[model samples]
Target: GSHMEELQNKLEDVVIDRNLLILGRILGEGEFGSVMEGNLKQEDGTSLKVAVKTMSQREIEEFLSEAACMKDFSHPNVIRLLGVCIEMSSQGIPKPMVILPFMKYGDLHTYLLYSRLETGPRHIPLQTLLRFMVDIALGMEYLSNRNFLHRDLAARNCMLRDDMTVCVADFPVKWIAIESLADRVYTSKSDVWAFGVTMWEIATRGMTPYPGVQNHEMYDYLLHGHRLKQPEDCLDELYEIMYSCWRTDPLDRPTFSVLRLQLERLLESLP
Candidate 1:
């Protein structure tokens, strides 16, 4: 799309101005882009750690959209967008980039894996998992109140700070319009569905959703009234919340405000 191409050109401009330089080993890679841990020096002679993402033009639009969403949002649980860079080169192949605050602990997926190894076969403490869920729910509450939908919320997108506070990330699928009829418009209910998946991720301590199920099969199953099986230790109330979000009818899912209230109640009930 021309919009995406323009976004790529803008990203190139940003990269060039910042003197972007790649550092350290590649942290990770996905279909849209690759993440690298790097350092950017400031005028004060201090170097700040940063995460640089080199992604496609299409991805740049989504990243820009997420940035737009974040610009108006200020919450402790949501990832802060320090700044963005848009670069382009008229003579060579176009390259776009985005810069973000780097987290030393990586993502929730890796953290849970490490926790599993350290705690033997047992999952991380239930209370700790609940706290994470609450943190995410709060973040979602903030988005929902602003009439936004984070269509791709998941454990992989959540980051942890040095003090163990959770921050929601990866908003490439975020939908800002609450009541638009546009083709890609995402409703709050869709975010609830993703939240349910996130809950499953936290409970399983990094286990893949629908393990052993092929992608096509899983999609069919989900489409044909099948739901992911609940873990043995999952609480009844929590399972109920998860199922509510996983409802086949998207409209049947609870709004984030409702979900947040329920989570708060559940947390209060827990010892």
Candidate 2:
């Protein structure tokens, strides 16, 4: 009872003034709501470019509760929750807006896809790819150590910062771990499995995971000892580290801390 009240109070302190925030074009949309471009007027009378995520009325309280918790997180690899605004729509329905720093490059998945465009920029170096994974692992390590289970981890859920560094964001079913699929159990290990899939996404320059396997067939596919194949020209060391995340036994999976260390070491060794 007090926990919810506590969250309510925390949300109140950060609830932004509706008059000072203006929502603009839609950046992305989903079943829950959409992310929009916004400008938040500051106390100094300046406006800051921001990304606004609208939350469904039903999820408002839950979203605010999470916002309260995330306020304590300070990792650079993790996206920060700026503030939230509760505004009423024309129909009198309360709409909740989540404020976040606007990411210029958008999500990692889309960024990877754009990199492969023949008319787009030249190929992204292996060092850059490895650094992306390193960033995610560092964020995951912080989250896992804090006993937070992302439950959803994928390249699409990660945003590219202005500096080209990746930040964990939004917080998938195609990225499920085998044990999680079979038992419906979730843990940091399950998140690790999804990290492996995300790594494959980066390695393939954003190709979908399990190309031929359907969602319904994932359990059987993983049950048959099938794992993602190494991308062409992917280093053996990198593949081995990614492969470890998908071990059938949850206990056998490397923790995000270990994965981050391994990733950092590999990056340092690269020319």
Candidate 3:
């Protein structure tokens, strides 16, 4: 009934000592879990700012086991799961907290949305937006090669680092692929499909995919041959590349590796 029994030893290696970390302000909260700001003491005696996500006891083991698996994940464009810490609640409950690199600029969705605001940051150029997609494609390529599938891929799941690099992170229902929605099948190709949707998100500066389409209506909408319309000002080539990702047959979709090359070529060709 519990997988934690087998994950205990690996968990030990993944766990960050309690005394070496200090949890701070709550960045986000929900009934399921909460994300907080924290400071992790390094071997050099300097403290590193980090984001801490504490999950409910119900999902603690699953989260911890996944964090252990995350130890093997190494890529610039993919967000790293730094470590995990288990703390005690007043009633003697075990609370699991996952440590992650702090993303100062926050999620890409918010970043893109803010760019359109007068009071927010400066407008993002097309080259910069396309570069963001390239970074995501590189990361996805790395994961797909390792036989991993990111079930949820979207701009919101990508975080902007201090240097402004977008790192893929976490998900939602709307960004799902057609076969995934209809047959519950998930594969790297499914991820590629979502990547296309995510590319549109960047192209349109974070507009939700399928515009007026409801979550429940997505399967039918996709089945009817309707796909995301090209974003205004998006290059014709870029639109065609992303459009290929929606081919009803998963095998017809381009691999992340090919998409990365195509995107890089597109970016280089931009004026």
Better structure of 2 and 3 per TM-score: 2
**TM-score pick, better of 1 and 2:** 2
Q: What is the C-alpha lDDT profile of model 2 across 1-271, one tens digit per residue?
A: 9977877777676678889899899977989899999999988989999999996655777767777777657799998888888877899888888888988889999889888898765699999999999999999999998998888799999999889888888865579998788889999999999999999999999998888888888789889999999999899999999999999999999999999999999999999
Candidate 1: where are CA atoms >4 Å away? 1-17, 20-24, 41-45, 56-66, 89-91, 119-123, 172-185
True-structure lDDT of candidate 1: 0.72
How accurate locally is residue 221 in candidate 2, as Cα lDDT from 0 to 100?
86
Q: What local lDDT does model 2 show for residue 164?
A: 86
Superposition error at 123 for model 2 (Å): 0.6
User: In candidate 2, which residue pairs clash?
Assistant: none
lDDT of 3 by residue, 113-203 (tens): 9999998879999999999999999889988888887887889889888888888886266678889888898988999999999999999
| lDDT for each residue of candidate 1 in 1-271, tens digit (9 for 90 to 100) | 9977756655443332456444567888989778878777766778778887776667667766665546446898888765566656687545556566788877887788788685533566788888888889989999788787676788988998777788888772211122221245467776887788788888888787777776546545565667767977988898898879877666777887788788878888888
* Model 3 misplacement above 4 A: 1-12, 56-60
Q: For every candidate structure, what is the RMSD over all alpha carbons to the true structure, in angstroms?
A: 6.1, 2.2, 3.2
- Supply the global lDDT for candidate 2: 0.89
